[PDB]
């Protein structure tokens, strides 16, 4: 029985919902359990960073988010091939690798290679055995300065580039943004019909000539 003025409501409570009720009193205790396991993991990998392997620079799909940059699943094989790192050896030195990723662009391919170049410089590699330091390991003084890195290793900051104030030229002054937007709207809509119209129009010229 509705009142004078109000909404039409659809409460989804017609099932036996009282049996399946999830309380959240575990949340303050869960946060301690997440923290204690995270701190215990960090002491297990005490020289290695707590975040883990590095993540690539990733553009978003779904054009709503297409101007944003995230941290990804792993570096592509094309990005590792340019950087000169074998795919089975990068995983032991803290590089996330996945074979699913593609490389359609060159800017993002070069950005991750540049990201991999600065990671190799910042990586302090311990020798396999302390008695015999090998060729590709760090120097002896870098052993004493090896420390844990808190937070995400090399955080991916969506940096924006500043631009200086320019003097407007005549091409920018006389440009018609609305007219160009309306015109490109029509030609994309009318691309197929004009192509079809020019298709059979050749056979009306052939039949006229013959």
């Amino acid at each position: 029985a509705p009142s004078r003025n109000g909404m039409i409501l659809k409460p989804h409570f017609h099932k036996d919902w009282q049996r399946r009720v999830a309380t959240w009193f575990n949340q303050p205790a869960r946060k301690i359990r997440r923290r204690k396991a995270r701190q215990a993991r960090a002491r297990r990998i005490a020289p290695r960073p707590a975040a883990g392997p590095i993540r690539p620079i990733v553009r978003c799909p779904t054009v709503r988010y297409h101007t944003k940059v995230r941290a990804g699943r792993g570096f592509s094989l094309e990005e590792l091939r340019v950087a000169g790192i074998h795919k089975k050896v990068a995983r032991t030195i803290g590089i996330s690798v996945d074979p699913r990723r593609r490389n359609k662009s060159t800017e993002s391919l070069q950005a991750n290679v540049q990201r991999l170049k600065e990671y190799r410089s910042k990586l302090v590699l311990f020798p396999r055995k302390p008695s015999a330091p090998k060729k590709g390991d760090s120097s002896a003084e870098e052993l004493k300065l090896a420390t844990q890195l808190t937070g995400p290793v090399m955080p991916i900051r969506n940096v924006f580039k500043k631009e200086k104030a320019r003097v407007i030229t005549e091409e920018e002054k006389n440009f018609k943004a609305f007219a160009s937007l309306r015109m490109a709207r029509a030609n994309a809509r009318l691309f197929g019909i004009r192509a079809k119209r020019a298709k059979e129009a050749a056979e009306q010229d052939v039949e006229k000539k013959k």
């Binding site: 029985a1 509705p2 004078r4 003025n5 109000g6 039409i8 409501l9 779904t62 054009v63 709503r64 988010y65 101007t67 924006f160 631009e163 200086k164 104030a165 320019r166 003097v167 407007i168 920018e172 002054k173 440009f175 018609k176 943004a177 609305f178 160009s180 937007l181």
Partner: protein, 147 residues
């Protein structure tokens, strides 16, 4: 606060604020929105016009990410950049118009709702309205398309 509720003042009253003829029964009118084409017809027409029926085209797999095109008016166009750039724009004698990138702040379309101050601009946006362009050109600015 149960002490502030109505039930504390209703102690000693037989009908408990529900009447003696029309007793507070369980469901006299039916559960939920019962009787739309029936005994609750008037309430469904005098307060919710258009409730019953279908209109428009169905769209099976709709993604809200595709239709994301946020708009900004010409009122809060100079609020996107800092106030320091607005002072130096009118102060500069060379006429160097500052660039306001609409996509950078998180909008795609520009609408010509408001008045623009008389100093040139360079507006980079994903989309423009017709009236928004003439207001920018009326000040002596430029509309720059970007994707």
């Amino acid at each position: 606060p149960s002490r502030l509720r109505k039930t504390r003042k209703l102690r000693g009253h037989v009908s408990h604020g529900h009447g003696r003829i029309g007793k507070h029964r369980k469901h006299p009118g039916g559960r939920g929105n019962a009787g739309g084409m029936h005994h609750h017809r008037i309430n469904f027409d005098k307060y919710h016009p258009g409730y019953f029926g279908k209109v428009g085209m169905r769209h099976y797999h709709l993604k809200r990410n595709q239709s994301f095109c946020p708009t900004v008016n010409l009122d809060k166009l100079w609020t996107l950049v800092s106030e320091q750039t607005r002072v130096n724009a009118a102060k500069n004698k060379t006429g160097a118009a500052p660039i306001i990138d609409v996509v950078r702040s998180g909008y795609y379309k520009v609408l010509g709702k408001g008045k623009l101050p008389k100093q040139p601009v360079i507006v980079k946006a994903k989309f423009f309205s017709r009236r928004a362009e003439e207001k920018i050109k009326g000040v002596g600015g430029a509309c720059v398309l970007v994707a």
